Design a protein around this nucleic acid. Structure first.
Lengths: 207, 135
RNA sequence: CGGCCAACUACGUGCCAGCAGCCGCGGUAAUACGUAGGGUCCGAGCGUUGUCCGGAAUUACUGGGCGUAAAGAGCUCGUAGGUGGUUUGUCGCGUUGUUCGUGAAAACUCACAGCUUAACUGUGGGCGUGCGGGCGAUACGGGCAGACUAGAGUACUGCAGGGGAGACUGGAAUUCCUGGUGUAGCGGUGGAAUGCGCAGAUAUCAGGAGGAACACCGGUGGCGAAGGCGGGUCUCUGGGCAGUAACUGACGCUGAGGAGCGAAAGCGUGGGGAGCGAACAGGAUUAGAUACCCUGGUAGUCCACGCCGUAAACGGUGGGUACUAGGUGUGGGUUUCCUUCCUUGGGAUCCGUGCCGUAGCUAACGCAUUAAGUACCCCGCCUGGGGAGUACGGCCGCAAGGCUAAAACUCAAAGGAAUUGACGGGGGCCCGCACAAGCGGCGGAGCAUGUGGAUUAAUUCGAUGCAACGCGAAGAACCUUAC
RNA sequence: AGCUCGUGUCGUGAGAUGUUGGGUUAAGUCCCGCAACGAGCGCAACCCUUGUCUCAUGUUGCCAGCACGUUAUGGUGGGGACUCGUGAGAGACUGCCGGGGUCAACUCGGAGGAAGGUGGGGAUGACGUCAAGUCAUCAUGCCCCUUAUGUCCAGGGCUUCACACAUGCUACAAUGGCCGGUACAAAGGGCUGCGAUGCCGUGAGGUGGAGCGAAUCCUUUCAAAGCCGGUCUCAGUUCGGAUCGGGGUCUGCAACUCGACCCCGUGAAGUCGGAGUCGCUAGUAAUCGCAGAUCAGCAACGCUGCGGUGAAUACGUUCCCG
């Protein structure tokens, strides 16, 4: 175990909590319903890139905000997708649950989306070098990106021997607290097993 | 001061040094000596001094030197070798211990004397000055 | 149908059954096994085996090598042979041109023709690389008859030297013997013990006997073909170098076989024997010491005369010759100029012996005017690694043994140089409760807990140096719980 | 404190150089040189806590100056003064001085200061190594089971014991045991939980329920070592508590296997521990108590924290280890 999770390193300094509420007696069941919501949204939607899911609660009403790179896919033009998600979130005993669907401004500057794309390419047929090079170039093309590192490991290329490979470009100062490191991990489903892709993206520092 | 090994061959890399020197001159002009830590600004000033001291006549290198004038080729063998690799003609004053096979336009004479080398530099400077006159 | 080398998937099997020219594939997901689809290459054929050539420059005439990869005889002398400076005339042997005869046919090759084409057949040339006869040329090689002095040798004048053989001889030291003084230890080691001494040792002094080796000079300095050679003197003797160039006039080089010399050890006969010292004895160390260390100690080491004939006999580099930048030490000798001419004054030159460095060469390391560069002449040797420098036969030897020198079988390598790591009972410089300085513990007792082992129907499973063992277990009566 | 990359250069090539040399540092930290010039991950800093001060701040927290108090005290009206709690900020930067230093890094000493030279302690663990561990948190390729290797239940087992190893606790006593009196903490927890006063037991505890989602109430107002007094007099003892007999309490459906605790009795080994070996450099070791998580209860002497009292020693890198 080498490196701690970058989000947890800067949780109180740079990054922010993804769940915002206060509970004293009802902390445990709040946590249970939050994880249920998260797993439901993870399983239901896979096509549009789900970069982040926030949950806010206040007594009866529950506010869940999600960021996706393809908002049109997850939303029903007549509300059909909205109807389905609303109903099955009511079924999660959430009382009144309301949704704010959002869109990320720069999908290529978001680590989770980058890892999702790399893993999706890896799954079907693509050689891993191609995927890493393409992701690195696309991210560095963005204005705020100051450094990106992509690393994936496993039975790469269907080999019998597991391997770890990584390429870096620019600056990725993992030990610096003020530097904001966007971290994204997502597992690629291949016929020979499971391939894990980790992405670190560095875009300046916040003081 | 000192020939950085590979000015001519590694031109693209060493041009970045001139770019950085200009950036740091701009930073001096804007006055950013207090916005960061004292150690960082001190190290930055030291870097400024080192870069300007090691690169005195290098701030005008646009493309490449069309010719090289050198004193005591034995001492600066790296510069002559770089010119020979690039094919740039080299004009040198060769002393009795030098190799005439490496220079194209030798000028036999002493280089250990300040006065003789000074006189030769006068001659070459007059040549280049009049040539810049007749552009 | 993995790559060489055109052409891939599925099922079955699992270190089996099997495949395979080599590398190598079979360990429940094989493009290498077996079978089916698909494909590729050929096609009345397609594969396998056997044999020859090619690839193989891997016997190298074309067309290879020998410092370290296999390969320079240990070194010389010299026989047969090979090879040979400048120049004149001649011969026409080699060499070369031309011509005539011959080189059967068939075959091969070129053209044409006939089978319906082709294979096949025929016709006409070429080829038949050669040999014999005539005629022409004389540059080169050779022969013959001369000439020359640059190679080679002689003469004369100097020079340096541990070159060799013999005889005689000197001093220091070790040992022993004798006689004084003189006491209780000496000797030896990492530490000791065997050992010597108390019957007078070790120490010190005087005297005597004997053998061997020659401190300083004394070095990367000299001599010798190599092995090798330094105490002094005398006798006999070999080679080298320089100068003059008086003499001879190619008399040169190499050298198969052959002959001679050839460290140390060893062998024979006869002497000698101080020190050292295989073997052999004890002591010690060690788990064991047929060793390293200690105390003794025989052959041998020494001399005379003979054998042996090997060495990391190495510069791991055969001999001769010519040419190809320099710089700087040092040994021997001749000479011009600074000139005191005292002075490595300096230069030039010939002969040695080192270091550094170009060009060039080499796989690299390196070599580099003392070549491992550029060339010519002659000799020795190499042809993957083991088996094996061995067996058999032979020759030599008193013997030990030496020289010459295989095969069966077996492997798919064995090798050279250099690079990056790792390591060292290699070196240097540093660090850390690493040691040292301290304080408190564990290992002993009782109990708690975990583990091994054993036991049981079951004692669920996982964790085994640091980095498993009050760990997963932050809570096993039922539940947990998987037994 | 190291691991690399781009370009350049050297080499037929594997590769080399940078990253080596001198100095310096905790550090590939920095400086000077240098066929190298730069860059990246590491180092350091940015974060938390702690040590000083300033401003803001007064409740459930303080109470110095004023009043009411009845012993029972900030208890009560009142008050920012002093603590404290929590927001913002200042403050250590070789900043200054003197000396070594290449006038460079760096280093020694001094002043000021609460603090002096990365102040103390945390969090943060580069490329990789060890096919290290984990298919029993989870997920997962392939293989296997599928009237069972799934699944329900009762009972049992995971606690078995001739031994061996490992981590701990309690001791072997007078620097102590027992009895009486008495003084000082921090941190943390609490709703179907903490649970006080009172009453009943000798004691676990029983009854009862005040007040508390808590700077308020409860954990007692909080400790133990400590201090004072008395006794014991060097003994297998007034040390030591194992083992065993009898009697109870509580939790729980249920304490046989197999819970903790309380009372009476019992009173084992043990006299400071061989070879060997472990931790620790200062608020540290040693020692004393308190709290939390897991949890109906507990095998907790374990683990994670908190405070009390508080040492000795370092000449120096030859040896052992990395």
């Amino acid at each position: 175990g080498q490196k701690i999770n970058p989000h947890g390193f800067r949780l109180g300094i740079t990054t922010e909590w993804k769940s915002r509420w206060y509970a004293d007696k009802q902390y445990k069941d709040y946590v249970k319903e939050d994880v249920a919501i998260r797993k439901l949204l993870a399983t239901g939607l896979e096509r549009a890139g789900i970069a982040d899911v926030e949950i806010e609660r206040t007594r009866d009403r529950v506010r869940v905000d999600i960021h996706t790179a393809r908002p049109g896919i997850v939303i029903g033009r007549r509300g059909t997708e909205a109807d389905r998600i609303r109903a099955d979130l009511e079924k999660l005993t959430g009382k009144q649950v309301q949704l704010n669907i959002l869109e990320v401004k720069n999908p290529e500057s978001q680590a989770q989306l980058v890892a999702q794309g790399v893993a999706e390419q890896l799954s079907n047929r693509v050689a891993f070098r191609r995927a890493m090079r393409k992701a690195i170039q696309s991210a560095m093309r963005q204005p705020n990106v100051k450094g990106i590192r992509v690393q994936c490991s496993g039975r790469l290329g269907g080999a019998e021997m597991s391997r770890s490979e990584f390429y870096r470009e620019g600056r990725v100062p993992l030990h610096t607290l003020r530097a904001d490191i966007d971290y994204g991990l997502y597992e690629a489903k291949t016929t020979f097993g499971r391939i894990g892709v980790k992405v670190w993206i560095y875009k300046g520092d916040i003081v | 001061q000192r020939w950085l090994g590979g000015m001519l061959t590694n031109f693209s890399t060493v041009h970045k040094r001139l770019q950085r020197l200009k950036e740091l001159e701009a930073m001096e002009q804007t006055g950013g000596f207090e916005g960061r830590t004292k150690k960082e600004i001190l190290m930055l000033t030291r870097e400024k001094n080192k870069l300007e001291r090691s690169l005195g006549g290098i701030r005008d290198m646009q493309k490449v030197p069309s010719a090289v004038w050198v004193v005591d080729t034995n001492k600066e063998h790296i510069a002559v070798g770089e010119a020979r690799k690039l094919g740039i003609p080299v004009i040198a004053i060769l002393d009795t211990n030098c190799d005439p096979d490496v220079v194209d336009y030798p000028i036999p004479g002493n280089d250990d004397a300040i006065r003789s080398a000074a006189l030769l530099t006068k001659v070459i400077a007059s040549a280049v000055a009049e040539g810049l006159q007749a552009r």
